[PDB]
Design a protein around this ligand. Structure first.
Ligand SMILES: *[C@@H]1O[C@H](CO)[C@@H](O)[C@H](O)[C@H]1NC(C)=O
Length: 392
């Protein structure tokens, strides 16, 4: 009875967004003559202005909305819980001329994979957690996460969240870092700057660390703080495309095929951060505050295990990680950076894929729960449509 196949078969009557905005017709002026550069699918009925899924977006049905031509909105329908969980090759998804360069080389670490070398913990991501010896989190080697991005509040100069470098031009982060009115947070481009290529938070890293400006900030349409922080997802373009170094390199994106196979293959994940989430919370000086980038290998534990741990509802776009709650074996809730990356290394091509964007996940100061994360595999078609909105 619930919506299957992600709305590709839907012909019922509903033509407005999740947030309450009017759907421009598919036969309308800008939605026709101006918007068409995609190889759409001619299997879905393109009726009037009804929400449909002609590109087969893993997020579902959508429409173009009244605004600056190109803008689009998702429509709140009753989808079925499609639990994603039960050389060195790559193919480019987005067109390099708008997503920037780096895609065709993503994941491959300058100072590791490309040097035919391993990091001190990557030969640990490939085992099922062996029990007893939990190799704790700690000081990160240099160049260990070349996608690791910091998000600074311009003035009065302040660090807000972590983030991920996907290409020379684009970065992904949690949407709550920027828009969150339970906290007043209504940040815009002008208030924010990023520092890419840093390993130490405080100290200045000469020539190494670059620092850049933001151009436009896209908060993904189906974002709702109003309940549980669903779709904690925001995308920000850079004013000035960054030059890849040995300390700067983008991270690859999984789709359903790739994310699932990673999950079926993998046993763990990596949260590189600074203690940002941990610390921001005025959970405060709960002891130290790591001066240097931090790293930890976190096992994903099965959905039924995660659902039972919290009060609230895990959506198939949110996912757990970490170790067991214990009297004398304590886990690591609220880990790394807000909107920071949680990653996995594809054994199928030795590349690194970002699987998780971190969240406030109240199972945090619960003090015996799992860290909750946001899934990344659904964004690909949305991203595609967003960058197409920009142009050369
Ligand atoms: C945030 O505040 C600015 C005030 O200049 C306003 O233009 C904008 O619409 C606000 N954004 C949201 C999402 O409320």
């Amino acid at each position: 009875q619930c919506v299957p196949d992600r709305g590709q078969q839907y012909q019922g009557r509903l033509a407005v967004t999740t947030h309450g905005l009017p759907c421009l017709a598919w036969a309308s002026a800008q939605a026709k003559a101006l918007s068409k550069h995609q190889d759409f699918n001619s299997a879905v009925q393109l009726v009037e202005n009804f929400c449909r899924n002609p590109d087969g977006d893993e997020e579902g049905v959508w429409c173009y909305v009244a605004g600056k031509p190109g803008d689009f909105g998702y429509c709140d329908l009753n989808y079925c819980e499609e639990a994603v969980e039960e050389t060195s090759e790559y193919q480019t998804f987005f067109n390099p001329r708008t997503f920037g360069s780096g895609e065709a080389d993503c994941g491959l670490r300058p100072l590791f994979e490309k040097k035919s070398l391993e990091d001190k913990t990557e030969r640990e991501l490939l085992e099922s957690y062996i029990d007893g010896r939990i190799v704790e989190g700690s000081d990160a080697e240099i160049g260990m996460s070349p996608w690791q991005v910091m998000l600074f509040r311009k003035s009065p100069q302040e660090l807000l969240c972590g983030a991920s470098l996907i290409s020379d031009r684009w970065v992904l982060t949690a949407a709550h870092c920027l828009l969150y009115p339970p906290w007043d947070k209504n940040f815009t481009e002008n208030d924010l700057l990023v520092r890419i290529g840093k390993h130490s938070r405080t100290r200045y890293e000469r020539n190494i660390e670059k620092i850049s400006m933001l151009e436009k900030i896209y908060i993904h349409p189906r974002y709702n703080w109003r309940e549980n922080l669903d779709r904690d997802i925001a995308l920000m373009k850079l004013k000035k495309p960054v030059a890849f170094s040995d300390y700067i390199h983008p991270v690859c994106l999984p789709d359903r095929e790739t994310a699932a196979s990673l999950l079926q293959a993998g046993y763990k994940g990596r949260v590189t951060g600074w203690g940002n989430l941990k610390e921001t919370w005025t959970a405060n000086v709960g002891k130290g505050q790591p001066s240097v980038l931090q790293v930890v290998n976190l096992p994903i534990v099965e959905r039924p295990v995660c659902k039972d741990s919290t009060r609230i509802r895990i959506t198939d776009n949110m996912f757990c990680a970490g170790y067991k709650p214990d009297e004398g074996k304590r886990g690591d809730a609220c880990e790394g950076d807000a909107g920071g990356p949680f990653v996995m290394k594809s054994p199928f091509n030795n590349r690194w894929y970002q699987m998780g964007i971190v969240s406030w996940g109240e199972g945090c100061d619960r003090d015996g729960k799992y860290g909750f994360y946001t899934h990344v595999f659904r964004l690909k078609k949305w991203i595609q449509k967003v960058i197409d909105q920009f142009g050369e």
